Amino acid sequence: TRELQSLAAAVVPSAQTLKITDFSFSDFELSDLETALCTIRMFTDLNLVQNFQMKHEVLCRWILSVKKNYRKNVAYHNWRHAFNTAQCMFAALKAGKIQNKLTDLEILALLIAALSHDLDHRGVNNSIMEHHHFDQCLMILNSPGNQILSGLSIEEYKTTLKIIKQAILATDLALYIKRRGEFFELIRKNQFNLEDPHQKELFLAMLMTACDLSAITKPWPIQQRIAELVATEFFDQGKNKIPSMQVGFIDAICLQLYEALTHVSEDCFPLLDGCRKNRQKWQALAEQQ
Ligand SMILES: CCCOc1ccc(S(=O)(=O)N2CCN(C)CC2)cc1-c1nc(CC)c(I)c(=O)[nH]1
Ligand SMILES: [Mg+2]
Ligand SMILES: [Zn+2]
């Protein structure tokens, strides 16, 4: 109750003071407590505390719960990565102007999903995984003192819970590759329409992958640092091939996604832009072997 006390007691600086609206945001210099505050600020400015009557001590306790159920011993797949995915969701919603295209319940679900989508990850070297992540998510959402959805009606609740699940499931890269075909194909023909339930759900899945991979879009000194973390998990847990690997990952997985995303909303362009700049940096490196 120590950590809970001083998080509950704390005052929560604005979104601007916290820089959680910048696509180029980083957390390297933030204490855990500070990340907890940033996360509170996120729920608040998306109007989630308002519209769904969340009690402060419950939201605080829920966040500390999510944080605790990530493992420090894992280099990349930990609370910070979860934290950053949620921040990128937030920036895409505000700066990227995606808030306008989605319902409140969807937004609530995307935020929770981003924060929870890798819960209890033990490292890439230890959609099966995603089902286990959603499980952790549910268990926490139903824990006494932690019920941040209690204010929702049973209908709202069921709808939110189903969306949370699809969102976490969507972070299986396998699922992303299988489904992106239809997404790119739709946009290609200027047919993509969010008001169709089926495409709406597809977009939420793609948005999830986009935030999940947002590290690839960060300013070069930041991306280099993060790439180092994922290298630590990949190879040590538990010529240099990495720059070539990164260029491959960017080509196969990242570029088209961020291209499609900016097509949906011109203001997500920075994600695309940061990704390209990073490809440039990794390719130069690759050519020196
Ligand atoms: C940086 C050191 C090496 O890093 C990588 C190496 C290879 C590939 S991969 O496309 O071949 N592929 C993915 C599926 N699978 C796990 C097998 C490999 C991806 C990464 C990588 N992934 C992510 C997302 C977790 C980020 I964000 C990132 O910056 N880099
Ligand atoms: Mg995952
Ligand atoms: Zn992830």
mmCIF file of C-alpha atoms and ligand atoms in Angstrom:
data_model
loop_
_atom_site.group_PDB
_atom_site.id
_atom_site.type_symbol
_atom_site.label_atom_id
_atom_site.label_comp_id
_atom_site.label_asym_id
_atom_site.label_seq_id
_atom_site.Cartn_x
_atom_site.Cartn_y
_atom_site.Cartn_z
ATOM 1 C CA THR A 1 0.000 0.000 0.000
ATOM 2 C CA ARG A 2 3.111 2.160 0.071
ATOM 3 C CA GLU A 3 3.263 2.764 -3.679
ATOM 4 C CA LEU A 4 -0.545 3.072 -3.862
ATOM 5 C CA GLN A 5 -0.554 5.777 -1.185
ATOM 6 C CA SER A 6 1.778 8.247 -2.858
ATOM 7 C CA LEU A 7 0.327 7.579 -6.295
ATOM 8 C CA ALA A 8 -3.163 8.236 -4.952
ATOM 9 C CA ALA A 9 -1.859 11.282 -3.088
ATOM 10 C CA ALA A 10 -0.019 12.733 -6.117
ATOM 11 C CA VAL A 11 -1.222 15.597 -8.328
ATOM 12 C CA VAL A 12 -1.406 14.799 -12.039
ATOM 13 C CA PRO A 13 0.381 17.244 -14.409
ATOM 14 C CA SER A 14 -1.229 18.128 -17.727
ATOM 15 C CA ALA A 15 -0.839 16.234 -20.987
ATOM 16 C CA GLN A 16 1.317 19.058 -22.335
ATOM 17 C CA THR A 17 3.649 19.021 -19.317
ATOM 18 C CA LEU A 18 4.017 15.253 -19.759
ATOM 19 C CA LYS A 19 4.569 15.284 -23.524
ATOM 20 C CA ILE A 20 2.250 12.314 -23.887
ATOM 21 C CA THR A 21 0.788 13.929 -27.061
ATOM 22 C CA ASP A 22 4.088 13.697 -28.984
ATOM 23 C CA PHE A 23 4.651 10.827 -31.359
ATOM 24 C CA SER A 24 8.356 11.180 -30.445
ATOM 25 C CA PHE A 25 7.657 10.650 -26.727
ATOM 26 C CA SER A 26 10.103 8.576 -24.659
ATOM 27 C CA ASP A 27 10.089 7.119 -21.147
ATOM 28 C CA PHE A 28 13.792 6.421 -20.495
ATOM 29 C CA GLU A 29 13.976 9.225 -17.909
ATOM 30 C CA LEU A 30 10.649 8.540 -16.194
ATOM 31 C CA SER A 31 10.362 6.805 -12.813
ATOM 32 C CA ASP A 32 7.688 4.149 -12.413
ATOM 33 C CA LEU A 33 5.579 6.580 -10.423
ATOM 34 C CA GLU A 34 5.855 9.066 -13.284
ATOM 35 C CA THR A 35 4.678 6.499 -15.809
ATOM 36 C CA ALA A 36 1.740 5.758 -13.511
ATOM 37 C CA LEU A 37 0.859 9.456 -13.527
ATOM 38 C CA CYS A 38 1.140 9.638 -17.337
ATOM 39 C CA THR A 39 -1.247 6.728 -17.592
ATOM 40 C CA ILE A 40 -3.715 8.481 -15.282
ATOM 41 C CA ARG A 41 -3.487 11.580 -17.450
ATOM 42 C CA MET A 42 -4.294 9.409 -20.507
ATOM 43 C CA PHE A 43 -7.535 8.030 -19.067
ATOM 44 C CA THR A 44 -8.461 11.549 -17.986
ATOM 45 C CA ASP A 45 -8.021 13.413 -21.281
ATOM 46 C CA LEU A 46 -9.820 10.753 -23.282
ATOM 47 C CA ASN A 47 -12.754 11.520 -20.937
ATOM 48 C CA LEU A 48 -12.685 8.008 -19.519
ATOM 49 C CA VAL A 49 -12.804 8.949 -15.862
ATOM 50 C CA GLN A 50 -15.710 11.299 -16.492
ATOM 51 C CA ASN A 51 -17.969 9.213 -18.743
ATOM 52 C CA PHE A 52 -17.553 5.954 -16.792
ATOM 53 C CA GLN A 53 -17.348 7.221 -13.232
ATOM 54 C CA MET A 54 -14.005 5.742 -12.273
ATOM 55 C CA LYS A 55 -12.931 6.235 -8.688
ATOM 56 C CA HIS A 56 -9.404 7.582 -8.294
ATOM 57 C CA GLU A 57 -8.102 4.976 -5.871
ATOM 58 C CA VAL A 58 -9.483 2.215 -8.109
ATOM 59 C CA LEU A 59 -7.867 3.512 -11.316
ATOM 60 C CA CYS A 60 -4.605 4.075 -9.412
ATOM 61 C CA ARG A 61 -4.732 0.578 -7.945
ATOM 62 C CA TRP A 62 -5.578 -0.887 -11.349
ATOM 63 C CA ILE A 63 -2.550 0.777 -12.940
ATOM 64 C CA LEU A 64 -0.222 -0.411 -10.181
ATOM 65 C CA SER A 65 -1.720 -3.857 -10.720
ATOM 66 C CA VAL A 66 -1.040 -3.795 -14.448
ATOM 67 C CA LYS A 67 2.493 -2.568 -13.779
ATOM 68 C CA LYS A 68 3.149 -5.342 -11.243
ATOM 69 C CA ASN A 69 2.036 -8.099 -13.591
ATOM 70 C CA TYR A 70 4.805 -7.327 -16.076
ATOM 71 C CA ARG A 71 8.242 -8.817 -15.412
ATOM 72 C CA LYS A 72 11.305 -6.577 -14.870
ATOM 73 C CA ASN A 73 13.557 -9.504 -15.751
ATOM 74 C CA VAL A 74 12.468 -9.257 -19.417
ATOM 75 C CA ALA A 75 14.450 -6.730 -21.462
ATOM 76 C CA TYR A 76 11.774 -5.444 -23.832
ATOM 77 C CA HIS A 77 8.389 -7.049 -23.235
ATOM 78 C CA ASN A 78 7.754 -5.334 -19.882
ATOM 79 C CA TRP A 79 5.768 -2.469 -18.315
ATOM 80 C CA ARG A 80 7.666 0.224 -20.227
ATOM 81 C CA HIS A 81 6.758 -1.342 -23.582
ATOM 82 C CA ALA A 82 3.142 -1.653 -22.421
ATOM 83 C CA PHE A 83 3.355 1.929 -21.215
ATOM 84 C CA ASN A 84 4.676 3.118 -24.585
ATOM 85 C CA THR A 85 2.036 1.298 -26.602
ATOM 86 C CA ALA A 86 -0.641 3.042 -24.540
ATOM 87 C CA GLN A 87 1.077 6.418 -24.992
ATOM 88 C CA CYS A 88 1.218 5.882 -28.773
ATOM 89 C CA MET A 89 -2.508 4.966 -28.739
ATOM 90 C CA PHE A 90 -3.094 8.242 -26.918
ATOM 91 C CA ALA A 91 -1.051 10.302 -29.361
ATOM 92 C CA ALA A 92 -2.772 8.641 -32.324
ATOM 93 C CA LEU A 93 -6.123 9.467 -30.753
ATOM 94 C CA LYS A 94 -5.304 13.123 -29.988
ATOM 95 C CA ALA A 95 -2.447 14.358 -32.220
ATOM 96 C CA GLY A 96 -3.389 11.745 -34.842
ATOM 97 C CA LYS A 97 -7.029 12.855 -34.623
ATOM 98 C CA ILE A 98 -8.439 9.296 -34.455
ATOM 99 C CA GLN A 99 -10.552 10.005 -31.336
ATOM 100 C CA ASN A 100 -13.211 11.447 -33.656
ATOM 101 C CA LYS A 101 -13.665 8.244 -35.656
ATOM 102 C CA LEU A 102 -14.290 5.961 -32.672
ATOM 103 C CA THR A 103 -16.898 5.544 -29.909
ATOM 104 C CA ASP A 104 -16.138 6.150 -26.244
ATOM 105 C CA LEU A 105 -16.398 2.424 -25.482
ATOM 106 C CA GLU A 106 -13.932 1.591 -28.248
ATOM 107 C CA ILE A 107 -11.471 4.188 -26.956
ATOM 108 C CA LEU A 108 -11.828 2.799 -23.408
ATOM 109 C CA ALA A 109 -11.128 -0.664 -24.766
ATOM 110 C CA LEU A 110 -8.137 0.332 -26.887
ATOM 111 C CA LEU A 111 -6.448 2.080 -23.973
ATOM 112 C CA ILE A 112 -6.941 -0.845 -21.615
ATOM 113 C CA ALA A 113 -5.892 -3.237 -24.378
ATOM 114 C CA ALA A 114 -2.697 -1.322 -25.139
ATOM 115 C CA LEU A 115 -1.752 -1.334 -21.445
ATOM 116 C CA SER A 116 -2.590 -5.003 -20.924
ATOM 117 C CA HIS A 117 -1.696 -6.652 -24.270
ATOM 118 C CA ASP A 118 1.601 -8.189 -23.127
ATOM 119 C CA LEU A 119 0.745 -8.853 -19.462
ATOM 120 C CA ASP A 120 3.004 -11.473 -17.823
ATOM 121 C CA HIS A 121 5.232 -11.874 -20.916
ATOM 122 C CA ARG A 122 8.284 -13.972 -19.980
ATOM 123 C CA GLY A 123 10.377 -13.146 -23.045
ATOM 124 C CA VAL A 124 10.243 -14.077 -26.744
ATOM 125 C CA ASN A 125 12.520 -17.068 -25.946
ATOM 126 C CA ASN A 126 10.202 -18.739 -23.375
ATOM 127 C CA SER A 127 -2.528 -16.625 -30.711
ATOM 128 C CA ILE A 128 -1.754 -18.683 -27.638
ATOM 129 C CA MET A 129 0.311 -16.009 -25.891
ATOM 130 C CA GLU A 130 -2.284 -13.327 -26.552
ATOM 131 C CA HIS A 131 -5.033 -15.442 -24.963
ATOM 132 C CA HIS A 132 -2.892 -15.652 -21.861
ATOM 133 C CA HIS A 133 -2.379 -11.859 -21.943
ATOM 134 C CA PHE A 134 -6.109 -11.187 -22.126
ATOM 135 C CA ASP A 135 -6.563 -13.643 -19.280
ATOM 136 C CA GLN A 136 -4.190 -11.640 -17.092
ATOM 137 C CA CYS A 137 -6.097 -8.529 -18.196
ATOM 138 C CA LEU A 138 -9.476 -9.955 -17.171
ATOM 139 C CA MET A 139 -8.245 -11.289 -13.838
ATOM 140 C CA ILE A 140 -6.979 -7.804 -13.000
ATOM 141 C CA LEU A 141 -10.132 -6.064 -14.245
ATOM 142 C CA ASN A 142 -12.127 -8.296 -11.865
ATOM 143 C CA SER A 143 -9.832 -7.976 -8.854
ATOM 144 C CA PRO A 144 -11.371 -6.325 -5.761
ATOM 145 C CA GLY A 145 -10.451 -2.675 -5.574
ATOM 146 C CA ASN A 146 -9.337 -2.677 -9.191
ATOM 147 C CA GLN A 147 -12.650 -2.695 -11.052
ATOM 148 C CA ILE A 148 -12.292 0.319 -13.382
ATOM 149 C CA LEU A 149 -15.272 -0.798 -15.458
ATOM 150 C CA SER A 150 -17.805 -1.054 -12.574
ATOM 151 C CA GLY A 151 -19.485 2.141 -13.791
ATOM 152 C CA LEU A 152 -20.413 0.554 -17.114
ATOM 153 C CA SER A 153 -23.819 -1.115 -17.579
ATOM 154 C CA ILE A 154 -23.847 -4.873 -18.252
ATOM 155 C CA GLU A 155 -24.343 -4.212 -21.981
ATOM 156 C CA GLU A 156 -21.562 -1.630 -22.175
ATOM 157 C CA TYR A 157 -19.413 -4.009 -20.174
ATOM 158 C CA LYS A 158 -19.886 -6.997 -22.461
ATOM 159 C CA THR A 159 -19.252 -4.842 -25.536
ATOM 160 C CA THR A 160 -16.107 -3.336 -24.004
ATOM 161 C CA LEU A 161 -14.816 -6.717 -22.858
ATOM 162 C CA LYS A 162 -15.244 -8.239 -26.328
ATOM 163 C CA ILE A 163 -13.431 -5.312 -27.967
ATOM 164 C CA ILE A 164 -10.577 -5.507 -25.403
ATOM 165 C CA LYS A 165 -10.146 -9.168 -26.279
ATOM 166 C CA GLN A 166 -10.045 -8.685 -30.091
ATOM 167 C CA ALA A 167 -7.580 -5.835 -29.588
ATOM 168 C CA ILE A 168 -5.176 -7.922 -27.485
ATOM 169 C CA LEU A 169 -5.614 -10.868 -29.833
ATOM 170 C CA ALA A 170 -4.830 -8.569 -32.750
ATOM 171 C CA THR A 171 -1.293 -7.997 -31.378
ATOM 172 C CA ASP A 172 -0.369 -11.482 -32.577
ATOM 173 C CA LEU A 173 1.817 -10.586 -35.546
ATOM 174 C CA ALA A 174 0.483 -13.750 -37.202
ATOM 175 C CA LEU A 175 -3.058 -12.360 -37.000
ATOM 176 C CA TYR A 176 -1.804 -9.036 -38.371
ATOM 177 C CA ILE A 177 -0.235 -10.622 -41.477
ATOM 178 C CA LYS A 178 -3.327 -12.716 -42.146
ATOM 179 C CA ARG A 179 -5.699 -9.772 -41.939
ATOM 180 C CA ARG A 180 -3.762 -6.804 -43.291
ATOM 181 C CA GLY A 181 -4.359 -8.015 -46.835
ATOM 182 C CA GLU A 182 -8.026 -7.080 -46.660
ATOM 183 C CA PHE A 183 -7.136 -3.738 -45.022
ATOM 184 C CA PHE A 184 -4.614 -2.603 -47.640
ATOM 185 C CA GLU A 185 -6.928 -3.929 -50.362
ATOM 186 C CA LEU A 186 -9.832 -1.837 -49.072
ATOM 187 C CA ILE A 187 -7.842 1.411 -48.760
ATOM 188 C CA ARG A 188 -6.408 0.769 -52.212
ATOM 189 C CA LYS A 189 -9.880 1.064 -53.766
ATOM 190 C CA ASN A 190 -10.991 4.081 -51.681
ATOM 191 C CA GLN A 191 -13.627 1.730 -50.254
ATOM 192 C CA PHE A 192 -12.504 1.697 -46.604
ATOM 193 C CA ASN A 193 -15.508 2.723 -44.513
ATOM 194 C CA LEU A 194 -15.425 2.760 -40.699
ATOM 195 C CA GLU A 195 -19.207 2.708 -40.358
ATOM 196 C CA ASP A 196 -19.187 -0.906 -41.524
ATOM 197 C CA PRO A 197 -18.831 -2.908 -38.289
ATOM 198 C CA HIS A 198 -16.528 -5.373 -39.999
ATOM 199 C CA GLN A 199 -14.017 -2.787 -41.227
ATOM 200 C CA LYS A 200 -14.218 -0.841 -37.955
ATOM 201 C CA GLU A 201 -13.091 -3.919 -36.071
ATOM 202 C CA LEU A 202 -10.356 -4.499 -38.677
ATOM 203 C CA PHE A 203 -9.085 -0.928 -38.196
ATOM 204 C CA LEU A 204 -8.973 -1.344 -34.403
ATOM 205 C CA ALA A 205 -6.784 -4.415 -34.970
ATOM 206 C CA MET A 206 -4.471 -2.524 -37.275
ATOM 207 C CA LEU A 207 -4.312 0.438 -34.848
ATOM 208 C CA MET A 208 -3.264 -1.997 -32.133
ATOM 209 C CA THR A 209 -0.395 -3.352 -34.252
ATOM 210 C CA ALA A 210 0.657 0.216 -35.139
ATOM 211 C CA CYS A 211 0.955 1.269 -31.496
ATOM 212 C CA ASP A 212 2.506 -2.037 -30.514
ATOM 213 C CA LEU A 213 5.323 -1.440 -33.029
ATOM 214 C CA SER A 214 5.623 2.333 -32.486
ATOM 215 C CA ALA A 215 9.226 2.036 -31.208
ATOM 216 C CA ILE A 216 10.224 1.566 -34.841
ATOM 217 C CA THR A 217 8.985 5.132 -35.470
ATOM 218 C CA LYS A 218 10.905 6.896 -32.703
ATOM 219 C CA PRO A 219 13.661 9.488 -33.247
ATOM 220 C CA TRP A 220 16.899 7.719 -34.156
ATOM 221 C CA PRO A 221 18.728 7.991 -30.795
ATOM 222 C CA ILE A 222 15.628 6.615 -29.116
ATOM 223 C CA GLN A 223 14.985 3.828 -31.703
ATOM 224 C CA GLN A 224 18.607 2.733 -31.453
ATOM 225 C CA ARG A 225 18.229 2.357 -27.698
ATOM 226 C CA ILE A 226 15.029 0.432 -27.910
ATOM 227 C CA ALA A 227 16.423 -1.780 -30.714
ATOM 228 C CA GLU A 228 19.140 -2.609 -28.245
ATOM 229 C CA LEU A 229 16.564 -3.775 -25.701
ATOM 230 C CA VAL A 230 14.795 -6.076 -28.169
ATOM 231 C CA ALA A 231 18.191 -7.417 -29.235
ATOM 232 C CA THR A 232 18.899 -8.267 -25.598
ATOM 233 C CA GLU A 233 15.650 -10.232 -25.344
ATOM 234 C CA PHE A 234 16.022 -11.958 -28.726
ATOM 235 C CA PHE A 235 19.638 -13.101 -28.462
ATOM 236 C CA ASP A 236 20.765 -13.018 -24.842
ATOM 237 C CA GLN A 237 17.744 -14.164 -22.823
ATOM 238 C CA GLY A 238 17.054 -16.189 -20.965
ATOM 239 C CA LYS A 239 29.402 -8.904 -38.927
ATOM 240 C CA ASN A 240 26.374 -7.465 -37.095
ATOM 241 C CA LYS A 241 23.106 -8.770 -38.550
ATOM 242 C CA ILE A 242 20.887 -6.397 -36.567
ATOM 243 C CA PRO A 243 20.761 -3.449 -38.977
ATOM 244 C CA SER A 244 19.911 -5.781 -41.826
ATOM 245 C CA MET A 245 17.321 -7.448 -39.642
ATOM 246 C CA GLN A 246 15.816 -4.055 -38.804
ATOM 247 C CA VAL A 247 15.554 -3.052 -42.464
ATOM 248 C CA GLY A 248 13.791 -6.357 -43.146
ATOM 249 C CA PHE A 249 11.355 -5.909 -40.272
ATOM 250 C CA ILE A 250 10.622 -2.352 -41.434
ATOM 251 C CA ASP A 251 10.002 -3.498 -45.030
ATOM 252 C CA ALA A 252 7.952 -6.624 -44.321
ATOM 253 C CA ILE A 253 5.860 -5.351 -41.440
ATOM 254 C CA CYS A 254 6.049 -1.648 -40.617
ATOM 255 C CA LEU A 255 5.975 0.643 -43.686
ATOM 256 C CA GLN A 256 2.719 -0.511 -45.279
ATOM 257 C CA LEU A 257 0.906 -0.388 -41.922
ATOM 258 C CA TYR A 258 1.966 3.205 -41.235
ATOM 259 C CA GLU A 259 1.284 4.115 -44.877
ATOM 260 C CA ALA A 260 -2.268 2.756 -44.580
ATOM 261 C CA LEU A 261 -2.682 4.492 -41.197
ATOM 262 C CA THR A 262 -1.818 7.931 -42.560
ATOM 263 C CA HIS A 263 -4.236 7.286 -45.424
ATOM 264 C CA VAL A 264 -6.957 6.793 -42.820
ATOM 265 C CA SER A 265 -5.787 9.928 -40.978
ATOM 266 C CA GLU A 266 -3.315 12.386 -42.481
ATOM 267 C CA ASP A 267 -2.229 13.417 -38.974
ATOM 268 C CA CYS A 268 -0.665 10.022 -38.186
ATOM 269 C CA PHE A 269 1.975 10.912 -40.790
ATOM 270 C CA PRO A 270 4.712 11.414 -38.167
ATOM 271 C CA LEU A 271 4.580 7.662 -37.449
ATOM 272 C CA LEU A 272 5.198 6.925 -41.098
ATOM 273 C CA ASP A 273 7.894 9.605 -41.253
ATOM 274 C CA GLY A 274 9.809 8.422 -38.212
ATOM 275 C CA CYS A 275 9.682 4.901 -39.611
ATOM 276 C CA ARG A 276 11.251 5.978 -42.948
ATOM 277 C CA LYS A 277 13.986 8.032 -41.274
ATOM 278 C CA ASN A 278 14.782 4.997 -39.174
ATOM 279 C CA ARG A 279 14.940 2.698 -42.187
ATOM 280 C CA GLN A 280 17.465 5.121 -43.690
ATOM 281 C CA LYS A 281 19.643 4.944 -40.564
ATOM 282 C CA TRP A 282 19.540 1.154 -40.322
ATOM 283 C CA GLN A 283 20.295 0.712 -44.065
ATOM 284 C CA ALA A 284 23.416 2.923 -43.922
ATOM 285 C CA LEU A 285 24.552 0.846 -40.944
ATOM 286 C CA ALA A 286 23.784 -2.386 -42.815
ATOM 287 C CA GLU A 287 26.017 -1.353 -45.722
ATOM 288 C CA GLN A 288 29.034 -1.054 -43.454
ATOM 289 C CA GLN A 289 28.253 -4.579 -42.193
HETATM 290 C C1 LIG B 1 16.570 -5.068 -32.768
HETATM 291 C C2 LIG B 1 17.105 -6.469 -32.731
HETATM 292 C C3 LIG B 1 16.357 -7.447 -33.597
HETATM 293 O O1 LIG B 1 14.975 -7.153 -33.710
HETATM 294 C C4 LIG B 1 14.156 -7.824 -34.607
HETATM 295 C C5 LIG B 1 14.695 -8.843 -35.392
HETATM 296 C C6 LIG B 1 13.892 -9.546 -36.318
HETATM 297 C C7 LIG B 1 12.493 -9.231 -36.476
HETATM 298 S S1 LIG B 1 11.463 -10.144 -37.639
HETATM 299 O O2 LIG B 1 10.667 -9.223 -38.565
HETATM 300 O O3 LIG B 1 12.330 -10.999 -38.455
HETATM 301 N N1 LIG B 1 10.336 -11.001 -36.741
HETATM 302 C C8 LIG B 1 9.260 -10.822 -35.800
HETATM 303 C C9 LIG B 1 8.681 -12.100 -35.279
HETATM 304 N N2 LIG B 1 9.584 -12.868 -34.614
HETATM 305 C C10 LIG B 1 9.604 -12.435 -33.285
HETATM 306 C C11 LIG B 1 10.613 -13.257 -35.401
HETATM 307 C C12 LIG B 1 11.286 -12.036 -36.063
HETATM 308 C C13 LIG B 1 11.996 -8.248 -35.705
HETATM 309 C C14 LIG B 1 12.793 -7.526 -34.707
HETATM 310 C C15 LIG B 1 12.030 -6.415 -34.011
HETATM 311 N N3 LIG B 1 10.819 -6.605 -33.612
HETATM 312 C C16 LIG B 1 10.083 -5.590 -33.064
HETATM 313 C C17 LIG B 1 8.690 -5.985 -32.599
HETATM 314 C C18 LIG B 1 8.697 -6.775 -31.291
HETATM 315 C C19 LIG B 1 10.574 -4.260 -32.905
HETATM 316 I I1 LIG B 1 9.388 -2.667 -32.100
HETATM 317 C C20 LIG B 1 11.873 -4.112 -33.381
HETATM 318 O O4 LIG B 1 12.593 -2.896 -33.351
HETATM 319 N N4 LIG B 1 12.547 -5.166 -33.923
HETATM 320 MG MG MG B 2 2.521 -9.422 -27.472
HETATM 321 ZN ZN ZN B 3 3.705 -5.731 -27.544
#
